[PDB]
Amino acid sequence: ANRFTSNIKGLTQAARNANDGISVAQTTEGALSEINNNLQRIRELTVQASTGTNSDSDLDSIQDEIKSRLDEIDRVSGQTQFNGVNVLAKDGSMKIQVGA
Amino acid sequence: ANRFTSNIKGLTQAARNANDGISVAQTTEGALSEINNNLQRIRELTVQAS
Amino acid sequence: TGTNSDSDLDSIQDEIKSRLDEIDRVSGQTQFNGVNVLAKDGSMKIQVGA
Amino acid sequence: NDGQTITIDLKKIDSDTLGLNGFNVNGESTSDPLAALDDAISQIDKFRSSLGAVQNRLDSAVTNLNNTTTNL
Amino acid sequence: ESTSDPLAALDDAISQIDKFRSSLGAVQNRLDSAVTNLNNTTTNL
Known part of the structure; x- marks a missing residue:
């Protein structure tokens, strides 16, 4: 039961993480x-x-x-940003948590 | 979320002020x-x- | 602008x-039963153990 | 964010800077009225072109801001 | 005299307020955990 609860909470958080990711992508x-x-x-x-x-x-x-x-x-190109991060200004790779 | 509130209000009001730009430009x-x-x-x- | x-x-x-x-x-006026929380910098101590 | 600016360029436009500042055709009559008048017209046209360039910038900016506001 | 970087200073104030709020949230959570632990211990004793 404890392991189940841990995994469930992790996935619930990862869901909001993925929503943040899709928001970032749409803003870009x-x-x-x-x-x-x-x-x-x-x-x-x-x-x-x-x-x-x-x-x-x-x-x-x-x-x-x-x-x-x-x-x-x-x-x-320069002054567009999301969450204070200039997404288009500088080349970079961004990671998105998806799993527990 | 708090910083997004600032960003949203700032962008909206900035667009409102930018409209004055086309106002001046069209008058000129x-x-x-x-x-x-x-x-x-x-x-x-x-x-x-x- | x-x-x-x-x-x-x-x-x-x-x-x-x-x-x-x-x-x-x-900031000055907020206070909790006589202690001004935001008027001055400080720390508060709370007893949680016998 | 700070330091966000769209710069409209305004140059004062009177008869003095436009050229003539005084026009004689009855004779002292100006040597080349046509050339001066054409240059005065051309300066006005250049200022109008710059103005058009600035409305295009401004409306692109405002539509970008409106698009970004919904996403945020 | 107009402030040199108004928006930057206001954002810094926002950050300070947010940090102070977050500390309050953390201490609230720890206090609630303490209260429930104390109640359970009282029942056990």
Whole structure:
């Protein structure tokens, strides 16, 4: 009975651990989706910049919007975080307890 | 959980304040849109004056 | 936020100082049957054995 | 977190910085009114382009914040 | 003069409050365990 109770309590805690893990993953996925949308807008207006009919002054505005989008990508990459942990800023491997 | 309360309220209020950014930006854009018409009028009047 | 004027920061500061006054008041006034728990640093001893 | 900022760039725009500051066409008449007027228009267009770049940044930021709030 | 790092100081205050709260929770748990042990010992004696 004591061993059963120990294992049961361990699994009950591991359940909340796994819920924390899925929350972390979803929070990361949101920022990835935002970066995706920014990249799509960049490729859009790069396609506009590609044609030679554009003058240099127009290309300056296109480059300005590129720089704004890149700065937005930089900010979303850097200062996004969950539980005070910059998940996208620095490469790393994270462990999640799942068992008793 | 306590720190998540701080994060949630901070993010919500930060978005609320950021909306003031688009407010200022759109007001300024309206102002320049107003100014541009006068410049175009002067530009197409100069050729007549010439 | 930079959009706020000086009066906005003044109102924010007034609200902030009212809050901080509440923290100090609640810290000073809370007491358990004559012992001020948060007014001063200290330790309490409890007997649990014969 | 601290040090989170989106920077809108504002440059003062009057007739002085725009160029002309005084315009004569009846004769002393300016030598190249067309070029000065075109440059004045181009500066306004550049400022408008920067403005558009900042609305795009701001609305991307606000939609990101709204998305993140629900997850937290 | 506006504080240099307001949010950092406020977060540090949050951490201090949380630690003080956690110590109280721990002492509450230990006191409750002591009470139940004392009751069981009283019954045995």
